[PDB]
Chain A
Amino acid sequence: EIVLTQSPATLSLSPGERATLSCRASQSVSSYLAWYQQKPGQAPRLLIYDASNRATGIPARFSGSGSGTDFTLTISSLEPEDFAVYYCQQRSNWPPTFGQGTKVEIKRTVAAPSVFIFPPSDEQLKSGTASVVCLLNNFYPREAKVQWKVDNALQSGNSQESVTEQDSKDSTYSLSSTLTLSKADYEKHKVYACEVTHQGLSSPVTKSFNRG
């Protein structure tokens, strides 16, 4: 079967910039090459069919070119909504095959996180486990450090992070960090703090509460 190799694997550019994505075939597929856009949680959306043709209703900023073994998808001027994974697909030979995708991240200017902290609910405490949640809201870039402290003791191995997909309108991320304790350990301590380090902050920011 025909192997499609896409490059680059990831691409980060600001709105208004031109984006060029490549798809190379292991053997000639003539012009039998399509491009799809897939946003998080959505089905793929046909952008280009048979190398050079815009699908119905596709805006003019998307264009395709190439033939044989080399193909190019161009976004002439990126928009924040263009954050997505772009796939090429050949229909020259069975089975139809897809490339592995190029993930396009939209660069924006630096945005510091808004930090919130949530103690465990009383309902959850009547269960033996306590979850403390630290939220970093609407920040860029994606890299951030969260450190948990319980009575000023640094925690390790008892927290899990989740990061939202890049927002399609303002290109920011949000992050949750959940610290899981036993109810006994939670009731044995007083001050619960999450400390956040991020490029948008001049110095790290700590949010804390006292149990009670």
Chain B
Amino acid sequence: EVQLLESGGGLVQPGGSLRLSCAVSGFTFNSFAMSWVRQAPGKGLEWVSAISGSGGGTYYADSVKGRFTISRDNSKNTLYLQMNSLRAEDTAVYFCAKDKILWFGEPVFDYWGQGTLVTVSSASTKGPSVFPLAPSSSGGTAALGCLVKDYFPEPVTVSWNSGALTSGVHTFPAVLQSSGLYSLSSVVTVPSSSLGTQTYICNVNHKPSNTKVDKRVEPK
């Protein structure tokens, strides 16, 4: 029943500021110290900051002292991280985390937020193009997909048939092209028979650019 729901991630210019929030439910928020922990892409976990239940006590990692502030609104069951003077090294997925232990000792984390990506870059947001992936014109299993090209920053989300199609779906890790824009593909394998009856729509969402595309993939 414990839930930590994070908000505020996205693209921010270097030197800029950005606030993350973490709204909790399912436990008595003000009884527990909370922390922020971050993870640069492809790297390990690094603790960022901690705040006591009340919280009149705060602790910071040396790498963020003086430019990050952790805070909480207990009446709103919400934890905050207000960041300043951001640099490329601050690009990371940020997690909020609940201390399993009571009081304001050093924590071990029993519940975590879903994480949200903060991308520190001066490059501009760019929505993707979505193209269909269909064979030239074969066997009992058909591969279909859509290619999501030329977007920045990460991430995009891809669903199929508004989430009704999940089995056999492979959404590939994005690849950084030489242009500095990302590209990925999402594929699904289905029965060849179902191509004559079932419709296949891929739903691409790029929140940094407010882009929501639904591309029908049909045999060409």
Question: Is residue B165 within 8 Å, beta carbon to beta carbon, of the partner chain?
Answer: no
Question: Is residue A156 within 8 Å, beta carbon to beta carbon, of the partner chain?
Answer: no
**Known A160-B177, A176-B187; contact A121-B108, beta-carbon cutoff 8 A:** no
- A101-B44 in contact (CB<8A): yes
Contact partner of A164 (CB less than 8 A), chosen from B35, B109, B133, B173, is B173
- A133-B147 in contact (CB<8A): yes
Question: Is residue B53 within 8 Å, beta carbon to beta carbon, of the partner chain?
Answer: no
- A178-B143 in contact (CB<8A): no
* Interface hit among A17-25, A43-51, A142-150: A43-51
- A50-B187 in contact (CB<8A): no
Residues of A within 8 A of B106 (CB): 32, 91-94, 96
Question: Is residue A13 within 8 Å, beta carbon to beta carbon, of the partner chain?
Answer: no
Residues of B within 8 A of A209 (CB): 135-136
Q: How large is the interface on B (under 10, 10 to 19, 20 to 34, 35 or more residues)?
A: 35 or more
In the complex, how many angstroms separate the beta carbon of A209 from the nearest chain B beta carbon? 4
Question: Is residue A15 within 8 Å, beta carbon to beta carbon, of the partner chain?
Answer: no
CA distance A100 to B47 in the complex (A): 13
In the complex, how many angstroms separate the beta carbon of B151 from the nearest chain A beta carbon? 14
With CB as the reference atom, state the residue of chain B lying closest to A92.
Answer: B106
Contact partner of A116 (CB less than 8 A), chosen from B35, B105, B135, B184, is B135
**Known A49-B108, A98-B47, A101-B44; contact A162-B133, beta-carbon cutoff 8 A:** no
- A178-B114 in contact (CB<8A): no
- B131-A96 in contact (CB<8A): no
Question: Is residue B107 within 8 Å, beta carbon to beta carbon, of the partner chain?
Answer: yes
- B143-A210 in contact (CB<8A): no
Residues of B within 8 A of A43 (CB): 95, 112-115
Question: Is residue B45 within 8 Å, beta carbon to beta carbon, of the partner chain?
Answer: yes
CA distance A165 to B171 in the complex (A): 10
Interface of B is mostly: strand
Interface string of A118-147 (1 = CB under 8 A from B): 111111100100010101010000000000
- A95-B61 in contact (CB<8A): yes
CA distance A49 to B131 in the complex (A): 48
- B131-A95 in contact (CB<8A): no
CA distance A36 to B135 in the complex (A): 43
- B172-A174 in contact (CB<8A): yes
B-contacting residues, A150-193, CB 8 Å: 160-165, 174, 176, 178, 180
CA distance A163 to B170 in the complex (A): 10
Residues of B within 8 A of A72 (CB): none
- B59-A116 in contact (CB<8A): no
In the complex, how many angstroms separate the beta carbon of B166 from the nearest chain A beta carbon? 12
CA distance A128 to B137 in the complex (A): 23
- B185-A133 in contact (CB<8A): yes
Residues of B within 8 A of A120 (CB): 131
Question: Is residue A34 within 8 Å, beta carbon to beta carbon, of the partner chain?
Answer: yes
- B187-A95 in contact (CB<8A): no
Residues of A within 8 A of B147 (CB): 121, 124, 131, 133, 178
A-contacting residues, B3-56, CB 8 Å: 35, 44-47, 50
Residues of A within 8 A of B126 (CB): none
Question: Is residue A87 within 8 Å, beta carbon to beta carbon, of the partner chain?
Answer: yes
Contact partner of A162 (CB less than 8 A), chosen from B59, B141, B173, is B173
With CB as the reference atom, state the residue of chain A lying closest to B99.
Answer: A91
Interchain residue pairs A-B with the least CB separation, the first 8: A43-B112, A91-B106, A209-B136, A116-B143, A162-B172, A118-B133, A121-B131, A34-B108
- 20 new A-B pairs (CB below 8 Å) besides A93-B106, A116-B135, A131-B149? A43-B113, A46-B110, A55-B110, A92-B106, A97-B47, A100-B44, A101-B45, A114-B141, A116-B143, A117-B135, A117-B136, A118-B135, A118-B145, A120-B131, A121-B220, A135-B143, A137-B143, A137-B170, A176-B185, A176-B187
